[PDB]
């Protein structure tokens, strides 16, 4: 269906020990495909995805310089904000910036994204229409005033509505077999007695792609939403993701339980029983 493109940028102060570190990571949906690190040996933008290794310096060299400009700005912002809030020079600070866009299956622009944060607190948000800034802090109000006056949102619009959309679109084609791929979970169920009377069932759904997954338990045909434990979706470390759930299952009552695993990437859900 639709697809998302995201970029995440972080700058962390490093008093004494050289200059603040700058980290940048790009994603298409769940897949990292580009990286950059100010402490990199190469000091240049690097690909991760096969299907973007065909890009020449006509992108990478300028993008590297752009990320350098981003780093320089973020470093200035960290110092500036310290001033704004009259904070100690001996203190540490972190600034976080992210942006990206959503597109439809036809590559149609859906939504733009841009948000900043400072020391764990929301700074400024830009609406999906990419027209209007929102300040979430004192310093944010100062910055917002500036950004509004210069229509900074317009710069984001040009990219997010255009370059981001076409960039992602092209990537979705070039990496079709790596991005739009599907991988069904290796479903299975195990029984884990707790006491003379108490036991649990574990519903496993490991090694699937993409990360999108829903687990459901039922008993006697009715959903079980109370006596249940679930884990958040986590990387498998092999390009796929893991997830499992469990419920309380008194010994001998296991026959009354059923687990279901639902995906959008699959034509049908999978059912587990014990």
């Amino acid at each position: 269906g639709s697809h998302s493109m995201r970029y995440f940028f972080t700058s962390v102060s490093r008093p004494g020990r050289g200059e603040p570190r700058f980290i940048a990571v790009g994603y298409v949906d769940d897949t990292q495909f580009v990286r950059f690190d100010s402490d990199a040996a190469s000091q240049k933008m690097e690909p991760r995805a096969p299907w973007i290794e065909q890009e020449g310096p006509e992108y990478w060299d300028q993008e590297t310089r752009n990320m350098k400009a981003h780093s320089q700005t973020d470093r200035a912002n960290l110092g500036t904000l310290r001033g704004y809030y009259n904070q100690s020079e001996d203190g540490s600070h972190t600034i976080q910036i992210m942006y990206g866009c959503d597109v439809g299956p036809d590559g149609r622009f859906l939504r733009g994204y841009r948000q900043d944060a400072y020391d764990g607190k929301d700074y400024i948000a830009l609406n999906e229409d990419l027209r209007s800034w929102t300040a979430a802090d004192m310093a944010a109000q100062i910055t917002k005033r500036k950004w509004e006056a210069v229509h900074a949102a317009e710069q984001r619009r040009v990219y997010l509505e255009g370059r981001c959309v076409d960039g992602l679109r092209r990537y979705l084609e070039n990496g079709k077999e790596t991005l739009q791929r599907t991988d069904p979970p290796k479903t299975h169920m195990t029984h884990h007695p707790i006491s003379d009377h108490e036991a649990t069932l574990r519903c496993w759904a490991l090694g699937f792609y993409p990360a999108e997954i829903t687990l459901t338990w039922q008993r006697d045909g009715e959903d079980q939403t109370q006596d249940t434990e679930l884990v958040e979706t986590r990387p498998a470390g092999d390009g796929t993701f893991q997830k499992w759930a469990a419920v309380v299952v008194p010994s001998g009552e296991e026959q009354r339980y059923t687990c279901h695993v639902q995906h959008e990437g699959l034509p049908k859900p999978l059912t587990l029983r014990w």
Partner: peptide, 10 residues
């Protein structure tokens, strides 16, 4: 494609 820094100042 990455974006280009513009008025990125606080």
């Amino acid at each position: 494609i990455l974006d280009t820094a513009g008025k990125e100042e606080y």
